[PDB]
Amino acid sequence: WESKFSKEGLTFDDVLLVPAKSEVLPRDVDLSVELTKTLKLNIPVISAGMDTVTESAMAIAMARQGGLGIIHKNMSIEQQAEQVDKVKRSEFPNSSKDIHGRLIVGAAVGVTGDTMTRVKKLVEANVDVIVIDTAHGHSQGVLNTVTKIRETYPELNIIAGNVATAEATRALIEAGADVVKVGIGPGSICTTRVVAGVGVPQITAIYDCATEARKHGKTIIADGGIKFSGDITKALAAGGHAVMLGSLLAGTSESPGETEIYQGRRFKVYRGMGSVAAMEFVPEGIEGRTPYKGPVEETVYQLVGGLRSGMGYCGSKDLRALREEAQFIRMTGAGLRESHPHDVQITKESPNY
Amino acid sequence: WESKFSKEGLTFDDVLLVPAKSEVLPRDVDLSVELTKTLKLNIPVISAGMDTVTESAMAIAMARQGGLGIIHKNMSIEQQAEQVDKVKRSEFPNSSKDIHGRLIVGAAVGVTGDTMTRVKKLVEANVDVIVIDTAHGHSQGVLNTVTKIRETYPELNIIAGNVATAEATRALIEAGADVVKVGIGPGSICTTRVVAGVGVPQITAIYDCATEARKHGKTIIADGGIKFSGDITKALAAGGHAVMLGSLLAGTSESPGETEIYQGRRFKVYRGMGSVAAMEFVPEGIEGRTPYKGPVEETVYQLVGGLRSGMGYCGSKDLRALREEAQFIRMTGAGLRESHPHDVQITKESPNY
Amino acid sequence: WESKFSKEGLTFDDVLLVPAKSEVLPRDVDLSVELTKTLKLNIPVISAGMDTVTESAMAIAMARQGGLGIIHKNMSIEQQAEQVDKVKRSEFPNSSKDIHGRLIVGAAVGVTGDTMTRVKKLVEANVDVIVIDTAHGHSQGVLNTVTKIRETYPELNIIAGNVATAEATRALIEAGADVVKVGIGPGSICTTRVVAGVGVPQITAIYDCATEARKHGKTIIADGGIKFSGDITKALAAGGHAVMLGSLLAGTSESPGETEIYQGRRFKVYRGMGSVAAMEFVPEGIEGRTPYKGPVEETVYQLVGGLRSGMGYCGSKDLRALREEAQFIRMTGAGLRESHPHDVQITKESPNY
Amino acid sequence: WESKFSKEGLTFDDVLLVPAKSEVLPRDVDLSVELTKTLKLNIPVISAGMDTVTESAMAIAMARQGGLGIIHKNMSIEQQAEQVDKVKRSEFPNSSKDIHGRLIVGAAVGVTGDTMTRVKKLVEANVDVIVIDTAHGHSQGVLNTVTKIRETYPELNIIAGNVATAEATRALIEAGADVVKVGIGPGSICTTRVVAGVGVPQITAIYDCATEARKHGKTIIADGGIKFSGDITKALAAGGHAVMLGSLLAGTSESPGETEIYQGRRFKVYRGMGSVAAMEFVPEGIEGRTPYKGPVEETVYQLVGGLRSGMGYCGSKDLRALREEAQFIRMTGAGLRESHPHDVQITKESPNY
C-alpha cells in the first residue's frame, strides 16, 4: 500500500545520450549482435510479427541487410510454414545466414490449443527462431507454453514476450526462453495503456528487463515506441540487444499491408494485432496508415546510419560498448523542444527526420 | 507557513499500473464490491446524481448491469420518491438486487431546511442508499446533516461527500457516513479548481481518502475525472471501491439530458450542478454536450472490459487484490504521449478509445 | 558558482489549495485587509497604475467596491493631482473611505528629476498612498527615492516596487516603504522574462517576499499573472495582502484605454508601461487588447465571489486565516488539465470562466 | 550500468535569472570580454561559421559593432583567405580591432587532408582566430588537429569544438585550444539529438564546460539554441564568455544566404552544415528560412539591449559579475507560459519579441 507511487518511468523523449571520447568513425563501428549463440544479426533490427509488417518479402529483405523478420501468425499453420520455407530457399554482403548459408527467419506463435502443431510445422520448415508473441507474457499460460516448446525442442531459439518488469523477465527465462521481448503499450497504434490503464515507459522497461536478463546471460528485444533513428541508439544504450520495429517499416514496399490513397499521397495500413480488424471484443489497438516509403533497404540504411552516428558520438566501437558504457541525461519538455528543429520555417525535411 | 508547498498530487495521466504475474484471465476476474454489508455491486460503477445523467431509466439500466444509479435531487421530494419507487418496482444475470429481489437504487439530498423531509419520503420509497451530495463535504453543516440522518435511520446506507483529504474523510465517518465520495474539482465540466483555486489531483485524493477510510473499515467512491476505461483500473488500484461517472454516461440513451444537433452529429447536454443552468450566483460548473452513444449497456460493457483487461495485466483475481496489491509507476508528459497512439494517421477508432 | 541552479519557482498553474474544515459560508467570510494602519481595504483588490487601467473613474469604482485604484503617472503632475482630487471629491455599503469619509485613492511616481514635485502636488491633493512604481525596485536609485519621500512625509503611505526576492523586500522596507509590490515579469503583456532573461515565478515571488515582509510587520501586493478568480485565492494564500490587477480590469467600462472593433467584438487596448507605445528603446512590454466586459463592478463581483468560494473551501473566516493557515499541493500539467473543464464540447461559458 | 540515468539537464526555457541589487544602469554596464589575451570583443556576440550566416560583409558588420564573424569553410582555401583579407583591409566607436587597427576576423577549418594548407593561407591573410569546427570535438582526429595547429602556430588563437562535457573541454584544452565551443544539438535547424539520440541541454552543457574551462584559465563560446535576447543573458550567466548565433543573424542584410518570397514576405535560407544541401549521407540538419530582418546592426542593437537590461536586473556591472555571481531559478512549463505574454490578443509585437 505505501510503495504504490514511488517508481518513476522514462521513455525515449525524456532522455539524451551524453557524448564521450570517440576513436572509431560511424562508418567503422560494429553493429553485429548475438541474440543467442545460434541467432546472430549483423544489424540490431527486427521487423515485427504483424500482418501489416512481415511476411516472406519483408523477412528476406531484412535478413539480406543483416537483420531479421518475424512471420506473423494471422494465417494458417501451412501458410506460415510455406512463408518460412520461401525465406529459407531465397537465392548483400551484410546478409545474416544460418550454418547452411540460408537467410535467417523467425515466426510468431500464440498460446492456443493449436500452438504445438504450429511450432512443429515451423521447425520442419527450418525456422531459426520461434516468437511466443502475447499481450501479457507474465502469465501462467505463457510460462507453460515456453516450457512445453523448450522441452520438445531443446536447441530451438525462443523469443518470448511481451513484458516490462524484471520479475516477468526472470519468469520467462526460468521457463526456458532465450530472448525476452520488452514493451507493454508503447506501440504507435497500441491503446493498452489507455483502455487497461497499464504499462511501463519504454526506456525504464528496457533497462529494468535488461538488468535482469544480464543476470541469466540472456538477451532483450526492445519492442515498440521507436519513432526516429536516435530512439534506436537510446533503446540499445538502455540495454536492448536489438530493436523490433512496426510503424517505421509498415510503409515500405516489402510490407504486406493494403495501400490507401488520401490527398494524392499513398499510404499503407498499419493496425494492432489487438485491433478489432486484426483479431477476426475489447480492443487494445486502433487502425491507421503511414505514408508509402519505398524499398525497406532505404529505410534501414537511414535508421542504421543514425545508430552509427550516435555510436560515434558515444565513442561506442560496438553494441556491447553502447549497452555497457553509454550514459543518459534527463531532459524536460523544454529540453525535447530544443533537441528538435525550432524557431525556423521548415521547407525541406530529410529521409531521417 | 513553512509546510505551504511540500505536498505533491498526481492524477490519472501522471501514472500507469505496473503489470504483474497473472493466473486469472480477464473474463474470470471478480468485479463485485460491497460498499456496505447491505449495499453490494456486481460491477464497481455508479451513475452520478446529476440532472443530465441519472433518473429512473439510468438507475434501472445500471442495476441490471450490477452497478448503481443515484437519482438526482433537482426535482420535488414527491418526484424523487416516485423515481426511486419506479426502480424498486422494475420487472440480466449480473443484476444487483436487495434482499426482496428488487433492483438497488440511490438518491441524492443536499443540506437545506427540506433535507429531513426529502430523506423520509425516499426511505418510505425503499431507497437502498442516500447520497449527501455537496460541493464541500468538510463543512459543519454537512457533518450535522450526516449525524441527524444516521440518528433517525440507524441502518440506512449513507454516502457523504465530496472531499479530497484524510481529515475530511475521518470527519464524515465520525458523523456516521458508511461511504465517502471523493473528488474536489476533477469533473469534466467543473471549474472549482479555476474559480476558487482549490482541489487535489484525483489519484492523490483517492489514495489519501482510501488510506483513512480503511482505518475505519469504510469505503470510497472515486467521483470525477475518469475519461477512459483504464482510468477506472487506476481509480480502483488507488484505493477506490467504486467509481462514479458523469460525462461517460451523459451521452447514453437512458440519460435524461436534452438532445442537440451540431454538424449532423447528435449530442446530449452535460452540465454541472454548480452551473448557472442547473442551480435555478458565482458558478463552479459550465455547460457542454457529449456525442449520443446509444444504450448505456454498450458503454458499461466496454468500460468493464477495459477494467477486466487491466486486472488481468495486474494479476488481480478480484477488486481487493487490485486495491491492495497493484503498483503504479509515474510518467512524464512524454510517457503519456507514448501511452496514447502516436506517429500514425488514425482513420478508425474503437468503442473504448 | 555551485548554487547557480538549486532554487525552484512555482506559479499559479503549478499549485492548488487543499480544502479544509469550514464553519463560515462564502457569503460570511471577512475580505478586509489593512495594507497600513491608515490604508484599509474592504476587498483585497487594487487596479494597476497603468494608462490602460486606472484614472479617476476606475479609482472611484474600485474604492466604492472597497478596493483601491492607483492613478497612473503617464500624464502631467497637474493632471495627476486633478485626477486624485476628483476621486477625493466624489459623492456603496462596502466603500473604502479616509477619516474624512472621502474615497481612498493612490497615485504612481517614478524615480526621475521631477519625482519630489510630483509627490508634493499629489500630497496637496490628499492622495492616500504613493506607489513608487519601477521595473527593478532593488536598485540604489529606487532606495534613495523611498528614503527622500519618507523623510519629507513621515506619515505618507508608501508602496514601493517591483521586486521578487526577500533581499529586495528587506531593502525597500529599510529605506522606509510600508508596502512592497511583488512581480518581475508575470504580467499578461510583459516580456521582461524573455528579453532580459530575468524573473521569479509569481507564487514563489509572493511567498519569499511575504516571508520577509512579515519579519518587518509590513505588507505585500501581489502584482501580475492573475488570470482567474482562483488565482486571487492562491496569491493571498501565498502571503499577499492584496492583489493588483491589470488585464482583468482593462476591458471594463471605467478603464481609460482606446476601444477597437475586430470580428464584430469590442475590445479595449491593453499595453505595458515598458512597451514602445506607453514610454513616449529596448521594450519589456508588447501591445494587445482584451474584450469589452462592461462595468468594473460586475467583474469585481465575480472575482470576489471566487475568492469567497475558495476561502469557504479552505475554511478561512478571514484573509489572515487564508495567508497563515491555507496549504498548497503541487500538480503536474496533467493536474492542471484535470482542473480545467476537459473531454466535453463547451457551448456556454460563465462570467468567471 | 547503475549511473545510466542520474544526470539532469536544463536549457534556456527551464530557468530564469533571479534579480539582485543594482547600482549600474543598463546603459553603463561593461559588455567587453577577452576570449584570449589577443582576442578581445566589446560585445560578447559571434556570428556562426555557416554558409548562410558569415562571409566578409557579416564579419565586417560584426567587428564594427565590437563582435566577431567566423568565415565559413564551404569555399576554396583561396576564397576563404580572400574573405579574411577583405575584412582585415576594411576602412563605429565600439569596433573590435587588432594591434594594427584592423577589424578582427575568424575563419573555420575542419579535420581533413587539406586542413594544414587551409590554416597556412588563413594565417598569411592575418586571420585573428581559427575555429576547428566539427560535429564531435571529443574525437581523436580533432585532438590531433588541435595539436598540429598549436605546434605550427604557437601564438595563433584556436577555438575548438563542438563539445558538451567537462571531459571533452579538458581534452581540447590539453591538445592546445584557447577557447572551447559548446553545443551538441541545440541549433534551430539541427537534428543531431533526434537522428543520433545524443546531446546535452544547453544551459547544463555551458555550465559543465565553463566549470572545467575555468580550471584551465580558458574560455567558452555558447553555440546554439539562442532564440531571444534574454537567452544571451542566460547563456553568459551559465558560464559562457560569448555566444555564437546562427538563425538570429541569418535573416539580416549582411548574411550570404539566398532570398525566398512566400506569402509576400521575404526570407533568407538557413540550413545546417550537416544538411544534405550544405555537405555537397545521413544528415544531422534540415533546411529552412527565416524572415528578412534588415541590417545586422539593428538586430545586434536589440540583442545587446536585452543583455544590458538583464545585467541591470542582476546588478552585474560587467560580464565577469554576470558569469560569477548571477543565480538561476528553475521553472515548470507553467513558469515558462507566465514568462511569455499570455491571456491577451496581441496586435503589435516588438523588435525584440
DSSP codes, A89-118: T---TT--B-TTSPBP-EEEE-SSTTHHHH
On whether the CB atoms of residues C303 and C45 are closer than 8 A, the answer is: yes
Written as one letter, the residue type at D149 is I
CA-closest candidate to residue A197, choices A207, A183, A185, A205:
A185
* D:146-165 residues touching chain A, CB 8 A cutoff: 163-165
Nearest CA in chain C to D21: C138
The chains found to touch C (3+ Cβ pairs under 8 angstroms) are B, D
Distance CA D138, CA D136 (A): 5
Catalytic annotation, pick one of C127, C190, C203, C326: C190
Count of CB atoms situated within 10 Å of the CB of A6:
10
CA–CA dist D70, D84 (Å, integer): 9
Place of cell 481612498: C104
C-alpha to C-alpha distances, C351 to A250, C51, C293, C303, nearest whole angstrom? 50, 25, 10, 10
DSSP A154: T
**Cβ-contact C180, C206 below 8 angstroms:** no
Burial class (CB in 10 A: 0-12, 13-18, 19+), B204: buried
Report whether B255 belongs to an annotated binding site: no
Q: What are the angstrom distances between the C-alpha of B219 and each of B128, B182, C205? A: 16, 10, 41
What distance in Å separates residue D301's CA from the closest CA in chain C? 9
In this complex, the chains that touch A, judged by 3 or more CB pairs closer than 8 A, are B, D
B54 grid coordinates: 441519472
Which residue reads 585573428 in cell numbers?
Answer: D128
CATH class of the domain at A12-339: alpha beta
- Three-state DSSP class for residue C347: strand
Which chain A residue's Cα is nearest to B342? A188
Contact state of A11 with B234 under an 8 Å Cβ cutoff: no
The answer to whether residues C331 and C16 touch, using CB atoms and an 8 Å cutoff, is yes
Strands (E), chain A: 7-8, 15-17, 33-36, 39-41, 45-47, 68-71, 106-109, 129-133, 157-163, 179-182, 219-223, 242-245, 259-262, 265-271, 287-291, 328-330, 345-348
Neighbouring chains to B with at least 3 Cβ pairs closer than 8 Å: A, C
> Cβ contacts (< 8 Å) between D11 and chain A: which residues?
331-332, 334-335, 338
Closest B-chain CA to C309: B196
Q: C201 and D331 in contact by Cβ < 8 A?
A: yes
Helix, strand or coil for residue D214? helix
Best of B325, B338, B342, B349 to substitute, by most chain A Cβ atoms within 10 angstroms, is: B338
Cβ atoms A40, A64 nearer than 8 A: no
Who's near A101: CB < 8 A, 6+ residues apart? none
Question: Residue A20: how many CA atoms within 13 Å on its side-chain side?
Answer: 16
Q: In what order do the strands lie in the sheet with D287-291?
A: A345-348, D287-291, D265-271, D259-262
Burial, C214: exposed, middle or buried (Cβ in 10 Å; 0-12, 13-18, 19+)? Answer: middle
- Between chains, do D286 and A20 touch, taking CB under 8 Å as contact? no
Q: Is B27 on the interface with A (CB under 8 A)?
A: no
Angstroms from A194 CA to nearest CA on chain B: 5
At position C65, the amino acid (one-letter code) is Q
Say if the Cβ atoms of C201 and D338 lie within 8 Å.
yes
- Rounded Cα gap, residues D256 and B204, in angstroms: 57
- Other CB atoms within 10 A of residue D325 CB: 14
Tell me which chain C residues have a C-beta less than 8 angstroms from the C-beta of D348.
277, 286-287
Method: X-ray
CB C180 within 8 A of CB C161: yes
| Residues facing A41 on adjacent strands | A33
A199 is in an annotated binding site: no
Strand order from edge to edge, sheet including A259-262: A259-262, A265-271, A287-291, B345-348
| B17 in reach of chain A (CB within 8 A) | yes
Give the active site residues of B. Answer: 190
Taking CA B314 as the corner, what is the angle to CA B310 and CA B316, rounded to the nearest 5 degrees?
Answer: 95
The answer to whether residue B126 neighbours chain A at the CB level (below 8 Å) is no
Residues making up chain A, counted from first to last: 353
C-beta separation of D31 from D42 below 8 A: yes
Is the distance from CB of B26 to CB of B317 less than 8 angstroms?
Answer: no
Q: Which chain C residue's Cα is nearest to B193?
A: C339
CB D219 within 8 A of CB D213: yes
- Provide the terminal-to-terminal Cα distance of chain A, rounded to the nearest Å: 44
From chain C, pick out residues whose CB is under 8 angstroms from the CB of B135: 313
Contacts of C206 (CB under 8 A, 6+ apart): C182, C220, C222, C235, C238, C239, C240
Residue bearing cell 501565498: C238
Q: Which strand (E) or helix (H) includes residue A314?
A: helix A296-314
The label of the residue with cell 519483408 reads A58
Sign of CA dihedral C288, C291, C294, C295: negative
Q: Flag whether A185 is marked binding.
A: yes
- B230 among the known binding-site residues? no
Q: Which of A50, A181, A195, A229 to mutate to test the interface with B (most CBs of B within 10 A)?
A: A195
Sequence ranges of the domains in chain D:
12-339
Contact residues, C window 256-275, toward B, CB-based 8 Å cutoff: none
Instruction: Select the residue of D7, D171, D289 nearest A329 (Cβ to Cβ).
Output: D7
The alpha carbon of residue B145 is apart from the nearest alpha carbon of chain C, in Å, by 14
Give one word for B316, left, alpha or beta, with left for phi > 0 and alpha for psi -120 to 50.
Answer: beta
The DSSP symbol for A134 reads -
Q: Which residue from B minimizes the CA distance to A330?
A: B332
Separation in Å, CA A69 to CA A32, A96, A279, D57: 16, 11, 21, 56
**Structural element, H or E, at residue B223:** strand B219-223
Q: Which residues pair with B291 in a beta bridge?
A: B267
Contacts of B217 (CB under 8 A, 6+ apart): none
Q: So which residues of A are the catalytic ones?
A: 190
The separation between the first and the last C-alpha atoms of chain B, rounded to the nearest angstrom, is 44
Q: Give the C-alpha separation, D60 to D322, whole Å.
A: 28
Query: Given the C-alpha cell 559548446, which residue does it identify?
Result: D182
Query: Cα separation of A191 and B349, whole Å?
Result: 10
Q: Which set of grid coordinates corresponds to residue A295?
A: 524499398
Q: Beta strand D68-71 with D45-47: parallel, antiparallel or unpaired?
A: parallel
B184 is in an annotated binding site: yes
Q: SS3 helix, strand, coil % of chain D, rounded to 5?
A: 35, 25, 40
A350 inside 8 A of chain D by CB: yes
Q: Cβ contact (<8 Å) for A289 and B18?
A: no
* d(C-alpha D68, C-alpha D66), whole Å: 7
Q: Which of D135, D202, D283 sits opposite A350 (nearest CB)?
A: D283
DSSP D32: -
Tell me whether residue B300 is exposed, middle or buried, using C-beta atoms within 10 angstroms of its C-beta: 0 to 12, 13 to 18, 19 or more. Answer: buried
Where does chain B have alpha helices with state H? 56-64, 77-88, 115-124, 140-152, 166-175, 192-195, 202-215, 229-237, 247-250, 296-314, 319-325, 333-339
Interface of C with D in 229-258 (CB under 8 A): 247
Q: In degrees, to the nearest 5, what angle opens at C-alpha D77 toward C-alphas D75 and D80?
A: 60
Resolution (A): 1.8
Chain A hits for B302, Cβ within 8 Å: 282
Cis peptide, bond prior to residue A74, ω within 30 of zero: no
C201 interfacial to chain B (CB closer than 8 Å):
no
CA angle, corner C277, sides to C275 and C282, nearest 5?
40
Query: How far is B332 from chain A, CA to nearest CA, in Å?
Result: 7
Residue that the C-alpha cell 515451423 belongs to: A122
> In a 10 Å sphere around its CB, with 0-12 CB exposed, 13-18 middle and 19+ buried, how is residue D235 labelled?
buried
**Chain D residue with Cα closest to A343:** D188
Q: Is there a contact between D330 and C12 if contact means CB atoms under 8 Å apart?
A: no
Q: What is the C-alpha to C-alpha distance for residues D312 and C284, in angstroms, rounded to an integer? A: 13
* Catalytic choice (D190, D314, D319, D322): D190
SS3 B52: coil
Q: Which residue has the cell 576563404?
A: D80
The burial of B280, by beta-carbon neighbours within 10 Å (0-12 exposed, 13-18 middle, 19 or more buried), is given as exposed
Q: Do D286 and A350 touch (CB under 8 A)?
A: yes
C124/D288 Cα distance (integer angstroms): 62
For D9, the closest of A20, A330, A349 (CB atoms) is A330
Question: What are the residues whose beta carbons fall under 8 Å from the beta carbon of C24, sequence distance 6 or more?
Answer: C311, C312, C315, C316, C317
With vertex at residue B51, the alpha carbon angle to CA B49 and CA B54, rounded to the nearest 5 degrees, is 50
Say how far apart CA C35 and CA A250 lie, in whole Å. 67
DSSP, collapsed to helix, strand or coil, labels residue A123 as: helix
B190 is in an annotated binding site: yes
CB contact D278 to A (< 8 Å): no
Number of residue pairs across A and D with CB atoms under 8 Å?
208
Burial class (CB in 10 A: 0-12, 13-18, 19+), B318: middle
Test the A interface: residue of B209, B311, B320, B332 with most A CBs within 10 Å: B332
Distance from CA of A115 to the nearest CA of D (A): 38
- Verify whether the Cβ–Cβ distance D337 to C13 is below 8 Å: yes
Q: Which residues contact C215 (CB under 8 A, 6 or more apart)?
A: none
User: Inter-chain contact C343–B284, Cβ cutoff 8 Å?
Assistant: no
Residue C260 phi/psi, 5° resolution?
Answer: -135, 140
The reply to whether B271 sits in an annotated binding site is yes
The answer to whether A103 and A87 are in contact (CB under 8 A) is yes
* Helical ranges in chain D per DSSP H: 56-64, 77-88, 115-124, 140-152, 166-175, 192-195, 202-215, 229-237, 247-250, 296-314, 319-325, 333-339
The reply, when asked if residue A224 is annotated as ligand binding, is yes
* E strands in C173-262: 179-182, 219-223, 242-245, 259-262
- Check whether C220 is labelled as a binding-site residue: no
